[PDB]
């Protein structure tokens, strides 16, 4: 395959990306949920699409299995976007990374135990606040961890705050703002710029 | 199982590596570079004197049991060259080369090596662009001797252009750090935004947007920038080296004045030599501080040349066990004289211990036929 | 200031070191030894598998930040050769050579180096004395190629003689350790004392007192020792190698059957090559560890004081004359310079009128449209 | 004060429900309709947590759950160092395997392995005396070899249909996998009286 | 083999002409991007003529490569 | 080449025409010392353009071909 | 073109021999599956010899296609 391979994040991000694509040359022929297909052709014959876990997008781009991709800034910070170019802030799928604990519960007199998917971000954030933390790695349902004692605080993406409030939790500290970003493989940027520039300019025009 | 980024180099690859190390070193010596071979370990006081934070994190620490002081395993030979030049080099021009193992705590690139065989050359005591030009001639003479089909692409930069703009524009540290991130990521739109509110903003936009077109770059800059002596000279040096590379060496050159890796240690022109489409440079070089003492130099990982170079197939010879033991003493001495001559020519000749003794990769047997020892292909 | 036992090798010495490393390696390759170049670092699990306590203390430790596991900087390449032979070597005869830097936490002898350039050769899969004989012939062929005026003296030992006596006498560990200390120090009087109360004590005294006289050593031992098959063969191997060294190589040989350094790893014959009257052996070798192995190694950097290269030709092009040239004249001059460099001349293209290489022997000067070499 | 039971959501949960009901534990609501994280049961002394399969061993090891049902693939990858693996439940059975492209040759390099099971991959290929570059992925292992991200994969295989439907074939069998009953070291000592009847009924249920 | 010619057919070729005027309006960087694009089309088996003059037309032209708003697209004739 | 002229005269018209070919040719004597008398002759030709741009295009085709061969051997042009 | 031969290299070929004995042990359905596999290998450029006799050996053999526990795999020689 000589065209561009585009790595898209599966869930929340995919919904707000589709309008940006259609404004460019690109739109999917099938639908991701209905079809059990991994590689998707588009309206543009020079663009191919991969529908991936949000966590896997940076990996595919960095190793050049995809030429470019749309990925959450929370995922890029946690992954370490060392070997990719972060070309555009798409300003979609906006949210915040925050700390959250139980409502009105006091901080214990010890090293805080942090339950999170975002272990590098947690460690980094609490290091910047001069706090030493014991980090516990989890993959899903961060809300649960403080309720059964698994950690004192969590770190997770928060938009409205309803999931936290519905489980008796409150937000504590703002870590940073998050949005989906356009990432491009270092080598693809040099070798396939002719294919990329018109798509990059249409995404730029779409905001 | 070896650690990540750590591999044996075995057999024909080991022989190739030894040939490359030796031949490249000898070439450097014939160009007038003095070979030095500093040790793997030193006190951190000398090894990390004026080191960047990346170099410090890249350097393994160990304790000297004779003094209780901290040492490091070197991650970079260049600081040892400075130590040596300070003691032995004097005030004039001094040239050094080296080839030695270095150890890194973490790999640089994806699946990169943590134990490169670092080979390099350095010129101290010359401010002129002629010293950088000489280093290019040495490098390319070395690259061309390797007879590779792989193509080397060179990217030139020059950190002084950005450093001088940052001075004249009087940028804060956070403004400097933001532009460097935007440059690193080629974020042209957001760079355009930030530059509309910064002093001399259009100059910082111009570097990223038009820095590739080095012939016209000075004429796209603001009057304050065009009057700065250091910007005019830096752009001039870029044009000189670009021309020299194309004309003397048939080398494809790109320019990137927003290439600001090693902002800490580079003091001027920078050189990055890429092999085919591999992400990490094969060769890294440029101006640095030799201290006021000028320094320029390059280095490379000899082990990354192994995949792109070929030696002639070896001649691997076995003497017939039975026939050799049938010989009288005078016959044996004649045969051993013949074997010594073959070995002088680079044939790999095994004198067998037993009738089953067989070398790996056997190409030939040395066999007796009617009172004559001849080589026969297997 | 470098740490004790740590020195730069600079300039002509560095060039000489590189020439020695390369020429010795190439010789080994032409004798059918396969070059291997293992890494400076490994996990300790592989690097110190079955290591002695001396080797463990000699090995610097560092932590792998990707796994949290311990690594070591190698103090010895031989264990890496074993690892390689186990994976690639098969059941037959396999030959290996190597040359690489090793790091030691403490110097081995008084005023020794902690960063030797270790070069060596090893044969796996041959039980015969013929493999040891081949290693001797390779070593001495290498030594003779160096054209040294320094003489190598060889001391032979054989750890099996003492190990078999210790078995037959049924010695405890503390008794074994005391005799090894007394042997290490050749404390003959105190050895005489301790041997009066030990079982087969007079045999352990005889090794130290008369082990030098290998022709008569079997006849000085007790009837139980003379009936031991392994003692008789070990003594026989010593006599065979001694003779081979004297006759084939005109080599002075001494015997010391109380040489028990590396009691842990040596399994038989041992070889120590001394250079003039220097205390630490230049060459160390012997049988080691079901797969047979024999080998030697040396510090290439210790050869530097005993070897000489031909004086280098160091050439400077005239700055003024070179800058007077047109483009076509410069390209002709550079063609000429490339040819001189191909022949091994060290030619400096001057950057300035003061640019002078260290140790200048010749100038390349223009006289009537001709670039000729003139001695300074 | 009661026992907290950590269950794996998805494939494992289906085959666990019969084993629970035989023990006198059974959920009052359903996990699909309700977005509740903590579930009461028929037994008032037992509480249930429906978790990601990957999170079960973490909750048990730290004592946030007293015991749990977890895949053996997850336990091997996690390193079940501080928990007791008491019973092989013999449910949710599958194999961990290597798979590459159909009939494709192994390249002349360090094999690049794309997998969720990075510790298992590294360990397996180390036991075969092979040096590998491991690439961490969280989903859709089947895709990785088709776009060049890795030479082989390591993943759980039951029928082999997902591999065959994407042009891949299994290569090496690494090990058999089934869901296991794990218990927290401290809970086992302190709350054995509560545990023993449930442990014995699970034991009887196969 | 020549007797098979009357009894076999290949797929119709894609024969492309770059717009002469639009190509000459480009700056150097624009030309290098266009040539990169053309190299990729040729790798896929498109037969692409870089015109020498405004009249230079390949035999059997099926498509033009034309510039519209900073984008080179293929249009059928 | 003379067969290309014959073909161009019949089929080429007055405008620009481009031709390529690859075929065996036979020589009565070799050109160089130990040269071949049966080369496999491959080539390209542009008719109907006076401009240096036609020669430039031929160079671009040639060098695109040479670079696709991934040779370590160096081509020098006189 | 013949003067380019000394200066160019192709990737080493894959030269495959199907095991004569194992192939003749197969039932008809097994043979058709094996031939489908062989057709796919040949589509990829593998050079696969269907042996006429037990001695039929191609020049420069790199691999055998061998049956091990109801599976046809390629093994290097
Ligand atoms: N609100 C978001 C949210 N907003 C934006 N994004 C982006 O979407 C990416 C994750 O996409 P997914 O939806 O696939 O991930 P997920 O829903 O966390 O987990 P899955 O079950 O889908 O695997 C993140 O990397 C973000 O960049 C969000 N990802 C997750 N959420 C969650 O959605 C819920 C809504 O939060 P409130 O609005 O605060 O109640 C909470 O559970 C939030 O943690
Ligand atoms: N076949 C299984 C399978 N069998 C048993 N299990 C167990 O189920 C646990 C994971 O449960 P999940 O619900 O998370 O499985 P999942 O497929 O990741 O589900 P999603 O979260 O992705 O929706 C594993 O730890 C195993 O113990 C399996 N988990 C995943 N699979 C996958 O299911 C697919 C079908 O396999 P075949 O039918 O053999 O092709 C393949 O992609 C397999 O990798
Ligand atoms: Cl809140
Ligand atoms: Cl390096
Ligand atoms: Cl299969
Ligand atoms: Mg350096
Ligand atoms: Mg002609």
């Amino acid at each position: 395959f000589l065209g561009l391979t585009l790595a898209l994040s599966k869930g929340r991000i995919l919904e707000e990306t589709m309008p940006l694509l259609r404004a460019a040359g690109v739109e999917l022929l099938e639908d991701p949920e209905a079809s059990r297909k991994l590689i998707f052709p588009t309206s543009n014959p020079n663009v191919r699409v991969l529908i991936l876990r949000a966590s896997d997008v940076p990996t595919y781009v960095e190793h050049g299995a995809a030429d470019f991709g749309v990925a959450g800034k929370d995922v890029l910070l946690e992954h370490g976007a060392n070997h990719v170019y972060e070309l555009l802030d798409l300003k979609i799928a906006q949210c915040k990374l925050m700390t959250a604990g139980v409502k009105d519960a006091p901080l214990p007199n010890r090293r805080l135990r942090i339950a999170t998917k975002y272990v590098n971000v947690a460690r980094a954030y609490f290091a910047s606040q001069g706090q030493q933390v014991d980090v516990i790695k989890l993959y899903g349902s961060m809300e649960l961890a403080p309720l059964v004692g698994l950690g004192d605080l969590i770190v997770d993406v928060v938009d409205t705050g309803n999931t936290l409030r519905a489980n008796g939790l409150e937000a504590r500290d703002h870590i940073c703002d998050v949005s989906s970003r356009l990432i491009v493989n270092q080598v693809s940027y040099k070798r396939k710029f002719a294919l990329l520039e018109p798509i990059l300019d249409s995404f730029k025009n779409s905001i | 199982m070896l650690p990540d980024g750590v591999a044996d180099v075995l057999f024909e690859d080991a022989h190739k590596q030894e040939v490359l190390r030796h031949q490249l070193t000898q070439q450097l010596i014939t160009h007038g570079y003095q070979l030095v071979s500093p040790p793997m370990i030193e006190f951190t006081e000398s090894l990390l004197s004026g080191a960047s934070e990346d170099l410090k994190r890249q350097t393994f620490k160990i304790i000297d049991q004779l003094t209780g002081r901290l040492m490091g395993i070197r991650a970079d030979i260049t600081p040892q060259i400075l130590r040596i030049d300070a003691h032995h080099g004097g005030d004039g021009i001094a040239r050094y080369c080296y080839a030695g193992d270095v150890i890194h705590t973490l790999p640089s690139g994806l699946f990169g090596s943590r134990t490169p065989l670092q080979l390099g050359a350095e010129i101290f005591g010359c401010e002129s662009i002629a010293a950088d030009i000489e280093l290019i001639d040495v490098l390319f003479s070395m690259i061309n001797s390797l007879d590779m089909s792989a193509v080397l692409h060179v990217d030139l930069g020059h950190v002084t252009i950005f450093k001088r703009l940052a001075e004249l524009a009087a940028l804060s540290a956070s403004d400097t750090e933001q532009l460097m991130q935007l440059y690193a990521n080629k974020n042209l739109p957001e760079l355009k935004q930030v530059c509309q509110v910064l002093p001399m903003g259009s100059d910082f936009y111009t570097l990223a947007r038009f820095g590739h077109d080095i012939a016209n770059l000075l004429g796209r800059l603001s009057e304050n920038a065009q009057q700065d002596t250091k910007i005019v000279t830096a752009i001039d040096e870029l044009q000189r080296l670009k021309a020299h590379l194309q004309v003397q060496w048939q080398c494809a050159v790109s320019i990137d004045v927003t290439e600001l890796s090693g902002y800490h240690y580079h003091t001027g022109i920078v050189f990055n030599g890429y092999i085919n489409s591999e992400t990490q440079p094969l060769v890294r070089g440029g101006r640095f501080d030799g201290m006021p003492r000028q320094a320029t130099g390059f280095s490379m990982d000899v082990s990354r040349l192994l995949a792109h170079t070929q030696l002639d197939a070896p001649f691997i010879v076995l003497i017939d066990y039975d026939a050799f033991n049938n010989l009288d003493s005078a016959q044996r001495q004649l045969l051993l004289q013949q074997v010594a001559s073959l070995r002088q020519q680079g044939y790999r000749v095994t004198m067998p211990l037993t009738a089953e003794d067989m070398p790996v990769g056997l190409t030939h047997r040395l066999s007796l036929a009617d009172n004559q020892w001849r080589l026969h292909a297997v």
Side-chain angles (χ1 to χ4, degrees), chain B residues 221-241:
Chain B
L221 292 169
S222 70
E223 182 161 84
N224 292 325
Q226 298 194 35
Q227 287 162 6
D228 188 67
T229 310
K230 302 302 198 74
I231 289 166
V232 172
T233 307
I235 292 169
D236 189 65
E237 289 166 356
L238 278 157
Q239 293 173 307
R240 285 169 180 284
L241 298 190

Side-chain angles (χ1 to χ4, degrees), chain B residues 12-269:
Chain B
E12 296 311 316
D13 298 336
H15 177 242
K16 196 198 285 159
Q17 193 187 58
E18 167 68 48
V19 167
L20 293 182
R21 193 205 66 249
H22 191 66
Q23 295 283 117
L24 294 171
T25 291
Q26 289 324 284
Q27 281 185 57
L28 288 170
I29 286 166
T30 63
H31 283 267
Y33 292 79
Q34 305 169 98
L35 183 63
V36 297
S37 180
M40 297 292 302
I41 61 173
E42 289 189 16
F43 293 123
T44 50
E45 278 73 21
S46 73
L47 185 54
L48 302 170
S49 193
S52 71
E53 297 298 298
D54 297 306
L55 181 55
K56 290 177 196 168
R57 289 190 301 263
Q58 285 285 49
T59 300
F60 281 105
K61 278 88 202 183
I62 50 170
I63 311 290
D64 181 23
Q65 295 185 30
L66 299 180
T67 67
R69 297 174 54 191
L70 183 56
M71 299 188 290
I73 319 307
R74 70 192 183 185
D76 193 11
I77 293 159
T78 303
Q80 306 183 300
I81 308 312
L82 275 135
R83 177 177 52 76
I84 291 164
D85 178 71
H87 191 278
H88 299 90
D91 298 344
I93 297 174
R95 295 178 176 78
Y96 308 95
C97 66
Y98 53 87
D101 288 50
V102 305
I103 310 301
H104 297 159
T105 59
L106 295 172
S108 284
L110 297 173
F111 310 135
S113 173
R114 281 198 285 176
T115 59
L117 173 40
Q118 185 165 88
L119 184 139
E122 276 162 41
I123 308 179
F124 286 69
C126 186
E127 59 262 55
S128 178
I129 196 60
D132 311 80
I133 286 173
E134 184 190 312
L135 279 179
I136 287 160
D137 292 343
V138 181
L139 181 53
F140 278 77
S141 165
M142 295 159 80
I143 293 297
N144 287 317
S145 76
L146 301 177
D147 298 325
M148 306 191 291
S149 62
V151 306
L152 192 87
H153 179 92
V154 171
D155 190 58
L156 304 181
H158 204 317
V159 303
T160 299
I161 293 165
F162 179 77
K163 271 176 196 182
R164 288 298 307 147
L165 289 176
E167 281 285 343
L168 294 167
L171 264 65
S172 55
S174 64
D175 284 355
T176 314
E177 196 154 48
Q178 202 195 341
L179 292 181
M180 287 176 63
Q181 279 299 294
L182 296 162
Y183 284 164
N185 289 291
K186 338 279 181 185
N187 199 321
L188 263 289
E190 191 164 58
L191 176 68
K192 199 191 285 187
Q193 178 82 333
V194 167
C195 286
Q196 287 161 38
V197 293
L198 290 172
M200 300 171 70
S202 65
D203 287 331
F204 300 104
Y205 174 71
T206 296
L207 294 189
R209 177 65 186 77
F210 300 116
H212 63 97
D213 180 22
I214 198 63
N216 299 305
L217 182 49
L218 188 61
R220 295 182 188 270
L221 292 169
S222 70
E223 182 161 84
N224 292 325
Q226 298 194 35
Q227 287 162 6
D228 188 67
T229 310
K230 302 302 198 74
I231 289 166
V232 172
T233 307
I235 292 169
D236 189 65
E237 289 166 356
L238 278 157
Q239 293 173 307
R240 285 169 180 284
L241 298 190
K242 189 198 193 216
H244 186 80
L245 281 156
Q246 289 181 177
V247 175
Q248 187 80 238
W249 292 111
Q250 288 75 71
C251 189
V253 180
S254 53
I255 302 295
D256 197 349
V257 301
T258 63
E259 180 51 62
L260 304 163
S261 289
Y263 190 85
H264 7 82
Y265 55 94
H266 295 299
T267 52
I269 200 109

Side-chain angles (χ1 to χ4, degrees), chain A residues 2-13:
Chain A
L2 296 172
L4 297 168
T5 297
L6 176 54
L8 299 177
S9 307
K10 284 241 284 170
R12 191 142 298 178
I13 296 171

Side-chain angles (χ1 to χ4, degrees), chain A residues 121-132:
Chain A
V121 173
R123 183 165 290 110
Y125 170 72
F126 283 103
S128 72
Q129 301 290 307
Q131 276 188 289
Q132 211 179 54

